[PDB]
Amino acid sequence: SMVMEKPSPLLVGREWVRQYYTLLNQAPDMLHRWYGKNSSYVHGGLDSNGKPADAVYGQKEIHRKVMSQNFTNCHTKIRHVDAHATLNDGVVVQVMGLLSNNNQALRRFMQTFVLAPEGSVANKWYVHNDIFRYQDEVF
Amino acid sequence: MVMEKPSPLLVGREWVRQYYTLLNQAPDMLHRWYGKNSSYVHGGLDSPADAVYGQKEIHRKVMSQNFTNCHTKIRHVDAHATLNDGVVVQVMGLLSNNNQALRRFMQTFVLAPWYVHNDIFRYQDEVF
């Protein structure tokens, strides 16, 4: 029986990063539930011209895009997380770390989240923006 | 002439240009784009350094970095619409400040309808 003070933006952001990458390994077919119809999502990749791949919107495309990336036994090493309160009770999250897919080599990345309160259930957060870029594809 | 409101990608890309100009023609004027709730960090290992809030605390940290002879290479700018017609901007680049090594960096802006709500800058060499 314990009431504590409300979660700081850091706790929210760092705790979301723990759940995000954990879900990305265990069950990435569940990841889309945290995105709404306004949400944006990109996760690296290139195109026919070697230019960084494009972003998708809405839970429907976001799920379809997440499943095309074949997240298989993803291993993650997170090196730093900032999370600062932003406008409209949102939280902006900058994540710097290393990620592997299909037991391949770890690759450095930069990632930006905007999390916002879901607005209809107490203490519920959804992802309004997911910007993930591997560093080897830009540098 | 009246033109359609610029897409986010256009706003962030133009903001990055305007940002790193003023970073090297008048870093003193940079605090004017911030507000009372704005947060700012620009790398640094204190003994990763903490963020400061409010325009005066931002103006003071900006001086401490002694920006001059800034050569910036911007390899990628992402920018999307976020909460309340705001723009979140992710910058990946290189920065050389006053005749020093050119270092990979990662920056995250949140622009609100334009004023800066958050400015988060990390050098990779202080993190990896």
Q: Mutate one of B58, B75, B83, B110 to test the A interface: name it (highest A CB count within 10 A).
A: B83
Of A80, A116, A128, the CB nearest to B127: A80
CB A57 within 8 A of CB B80: no
The CA-to-CA distance between both ends of chain A, in Å, stands at 51
What is the nearest CA distance from B89 to chain A, expressed in angstroms?
A: 9
Q: Given phi > 0 = left and psi -120 to 50 = alpha, else beta, which region is A32? A: alpha
What is the C-alpha separation between A128 and B83, in angstroms, rounded? 7
Of A108, A110, A135, the CB nearest to B90: A110
What is the C-alpha separation between B77 and B89, in angstroms, rounded? 7
Q: What is the 3-state secondary structure (H, E, C) of chain B?
A: CCCCCCCHHHHHHHHHHHHHHHHHHCHHHHHHHEEEEEEEEECCCCCCCCCEECHHHHHHHHHHCCCCCCEEEEEEEEEEEECCCEEEEEEEEEEECCCCCCEEEEEEEEEECCEEEEEEEEEHHHCC
Amino acid, single-letter form, for residue A84: H
Are A131 and B92 within 8 A, CB to CB? Answer: no
What is the C-alpha separation between B119 and B89, in angstroms, rounded? 10
Residue (of A36, A111, A28) closest to A66 by Cα position: A28
Of B41, B82, B127, the CB nearest to A114: B82
Are A131 and B104 within 8 A, CB to CB? Answer: no
What is the nearest CA distance from B4 to chain A, expressed in angstroms?
A: 21
**Tokens standing for residue A137:** 């594809």
Residue A98, H or E segment: strand A91-100
DSSP letter for A32, please.
G
Of A108, A110, A128, the CB nearest to B82: A128
Are B92 and A133 within 8 A, CB to CB? Answer: yes
Residue (of A85, A105, A102, A101) closest to A93 by Cα position: A85
Residue B83, strand partner residues: none
Are A79 and B128 within 8 A, CB to CB? Answer: yes
- Please give the resolution of this entry in Å, rounded to 1 decimal: 2.4
What is the nearest CA distance from A49 to chain B, expressed in angstroms?
A: 15
HSE at residue B110, side-chain half, CA atoms within 13 A, is: 30
**Tokens standing for residue A12:** 């929210």
**Would you list the domain boundaries of chain A?**
1-139
